[PDB]
Each structure stands twice: as C-alpha cells, then as structure tokens.
C-alpha cells in the first residue's frame, strides 16, 4: 500500500471551515441592509405635537 505519489495532506493549510469569505464587492453591496442602525429615530419626544393643540 506504499503509494509514493499520495499527497500526505488533503489540503495545504487547515485554518478554515470550508466557507468562503463573502468577497469585497459583495460586502460593499450588502451594507445597504445596515440602514436600521443608521436610521434617524428621534428619542427626544417633545411634550406638544399635533394632537394636543386643541388642549
């Protein structure tokens, strides 16, 4: 069973899990889904707005 042409390593290097790192232009384009934390919500709710004017 001595096969001198066998690789002795299936892959060169081992620090991975097989996944692909989601290339740079795809990472650029998927940042359009990060507008929830860039939303301009206003946690400064004023005491008077347009339903209390009659009161």
């Amino acid at each position: 069973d001595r096969k001198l042409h066998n690789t002795t390593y299936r892959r060169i290097g081992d620090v991975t899990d097989g996944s692909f790192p989601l290339t740079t232009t795809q990472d650029h384009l998927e940042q359009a889904n990060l507008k929830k934390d860039f939303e301009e919500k206003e946690p400064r709710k004023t005491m008077v707005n347009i339903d209390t004017i009659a009161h």
Binding site: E39, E40, P43, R44, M47
Partner: protein, 376 residues
C-alpha cells in the same frame, strides 16, 4: 480583582447626533456591583472598573433601558455562553394577564405579586377584540370553553403583566394555584385564584404554563410587534404617576389599592421604562423654581414608572379632588398636616415622595395625552 464574575451583555446606545446606534459591551461585575464597558469597532476602553450606583443586579433585564452616566443603553443580547446559561435561569419572562372578573381588584393582586417578589417589567390595560385572541387560539375548539373564554376576553378589559422571579415559570403557577377556582379555593388558602375568582375561566389569571409559549404570549403582547392599544378615553381625568422608588420597594400594590378604595376609577394603566430626555420633557415645568429638578429626573430615570389615568364620578373636578387626596409636596409636611392623604403613609423625602400629580388643574388632559397617545 481581575475576574470575579463577568456578566456581559451587548448593549446599544443611540448617539443623539450622527444618527448612529453605537454598540458596546456591558461587563457587570457582581460581588462589588461595578460596571465596565467595551467599545465594539475601534477597540478601546469606554469605561473602567468604576462603581456606578444606577445599575443594580435587579435592574438588568435584557430588553430594557439603563442610564449609566446619562447614556441610555438598551440591553439587547446575551453575549457569552457563561452569562447565557447563568441568566437563562433566575430571569424568566412570564405573562400575568388579569381576567376581566378582577378588573376592579387588581390592586391587591399587584400587592401579592410584589410581596412574593416578582419584578414586574411591563404592564398595560387593554381591551382586546375578536381577532386579538392569538393568546388563546392555541387551545382551539377542544370544548366550548374556547367560545366561553373568547367571549370572556372580549367582554371587559384586562391588565397584561410581564413578571419575573427566580425560575419564574412555576413560582407564578404556585402563586396562582391550580385551575378550577372552587377546587383552588378548597386546597390553596392564599393563592390569587383562591382569593379572587368564582369558577372555571373566571380564574383572574391564566398563567404561562410552558417555556417559549410564555415567549410567544409576550411577543404577541409587549415587544417590537405589539399592536395592542391602551384604554385611555381622555375626558375629565388626571395623572397618577407612581415613582420608581415606590414601585421598587413593594408599595405599588398598596398605592393602587388605596387609590381604588378611597374612590376614583383607574381608566388607563401603563408601565414605562422612562428615558433621561423624556423625563426632562415631563419635568421641564419643574425647572429652577423648586430646586430638585435634577434629583427628580434622576429618580424617574433610575427605574420603571407606573402611569395611571384617574377619573371620578363625584363631579367637582378630578384634578383638585386628586390633588387633595395626594399629599402636597413633602412627606414630613404631609405627615404633620393632613396625614390621612397619600404621600404621608408612603413617603421618604421630597424627591422620592411616592407619586406624582398634575399640580395645575388645566394641563391634566395634555399630560394624559403625552403619556397615553404620544409616548407609547
């Protein structure tokens, strides 16, 4: 020392300028009650060891608001597997929906829950409807108790509660006792279902029988998808703000029981986690004319508050009647003068009285609108 218990959660703070919600790592240390904060993205040291006196172990509650150094953090995620498996226990969400049979006896129920030691975190008074029975289509047409209980939900308001105690699903069931209120009264002598309620489905609560069904019930209720509405109807009414200190030290049940027993009527109930900015807008009339503005804002922000809408059938005017029933400003002055009122039987100092009332008898409408139509 270097490591003495490292309860770490992801927290989010909205920067008022630039629109970002920056993400930080909260690193509460027990056995010395300190806080540490890391800055996710651009690795740095946001807060050192410190000794913050606003954050206590009972506050936490992932999904809540904490104000450390006036930065209104929202705790959003169980970071670290240690903290996840250490606070999956102890902290359990449970639903405490009061049935419409106890629509007038909720004060004693709150009193027994706070005596048992359940830290309520969110509460509302809600009407429900035909289609709003997602709480109860799980037990779908098994017997006509389905139709009877749906009719009972549609007839009369309810008070939804979000309670928590150690292993809370099970101590809530122990506080309720078993179902079948007659049998529950026969065996359990001090449960909620024994003290209040008549028979089956007139049981004053329903419980949170199983885990993640409690989560489903709360997510149908209180949360980012909650489409429930309060029972505010305006008219001649006034505010009954119950301060976080009085909520914390087991007095909310006594206060609301006294409110119901002396007279009046609680028309809308709500439970708030207030913010620094919103507390300052509520107490902006209490600017530098009373000289406890900062302490009043701090005690509003340093815990959850109880908003109540009060009407009366005694005519006159609800604002002056409620202002006479509440102690005027100070617990000592309320004890020496008119001791039968509020703010004297429940009172520590001028900052933490017990409660808050509409001082001006012409802006109770606007304050009720601010609580129940604006900040909601």
């Amino acid at each position: 020392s270097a490591q003495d218990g490292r309860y770490s959660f992801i927290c989010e703070w909205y920067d008022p300028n630039a629109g970002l919600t920056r993400r930080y790592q909260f690193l509460f240390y027990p056995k010395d009650n300190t806080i540490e904060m890391f800055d996710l993205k651009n690795r740095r040291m946001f807060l050192k060891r410190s000794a913050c006196d606003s954050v206590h172990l009972a506050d936490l509650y992932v999904g809540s608001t904490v104000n450390v150094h006036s930065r209104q953090l929202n705790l959003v995620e169980y970071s670290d597997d240690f903290t996840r498996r250490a606070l999956t226990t102890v902290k359990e969400k449970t639903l405490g929906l009061i049935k419409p049979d106890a629509i007038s006896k909720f004060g004693p129920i709150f009193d027994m829950t706070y005596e048992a030691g359940f830290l309520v975190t969110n509460a509302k008074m809600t009407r429900l409807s035909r289609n709003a029975a997602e709480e109860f289509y799980a037990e779908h047409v098994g017997k006509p108790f389905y139709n009877n209980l749906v009719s009972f939900m549609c007839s009369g308001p309810i008070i939804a509660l979000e309670l928590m105690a150690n292993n809370g699903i099970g101590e809530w069931r122990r506080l309720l006792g078993p179902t079948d209120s007659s049998t529950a009264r026969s065996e359990a002598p001090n449960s909620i279902r024994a003290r209040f309620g008549t028979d089956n489905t007139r049981n004053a609560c329903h419980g949170s029988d199983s885990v993640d069904s409690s989560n489903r019930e709360t997510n149908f209720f209180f949360g980012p998808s909650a489409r429930m509405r309060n029972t505010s109807t305006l008219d001649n009414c006034t505010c009954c703000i119950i301060k976080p200190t009085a909520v914390k030290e087991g007095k909310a049940g006594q206060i609301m029981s006294a409110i119901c027993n002396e007279g009046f009527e609680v028309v809308a109930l709500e439970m708030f986690h207030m913010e620094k900015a919103n507390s300052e807008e509520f107490f902006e009339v209490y600017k530098g004319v009373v000289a406890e503005y900062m302490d009043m804002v701090t005690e509003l922000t340093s815990g959850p508050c109880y908003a109540l809408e009060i009407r009366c059938s005694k005519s006159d005017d609800v604002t002056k009647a409620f202002r006479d029933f509440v102690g005027p400003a100070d617990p000592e002055i309320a004890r020496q003068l008119r001791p039968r009122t509020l703010r004297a039987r429940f009172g520590n100092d001028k900052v933490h009285n017990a409660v808050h009332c509409t001082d001006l008898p012409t802006d109770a409408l606007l304050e009720v609108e601010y609580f129940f139509k604006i900040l909601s």
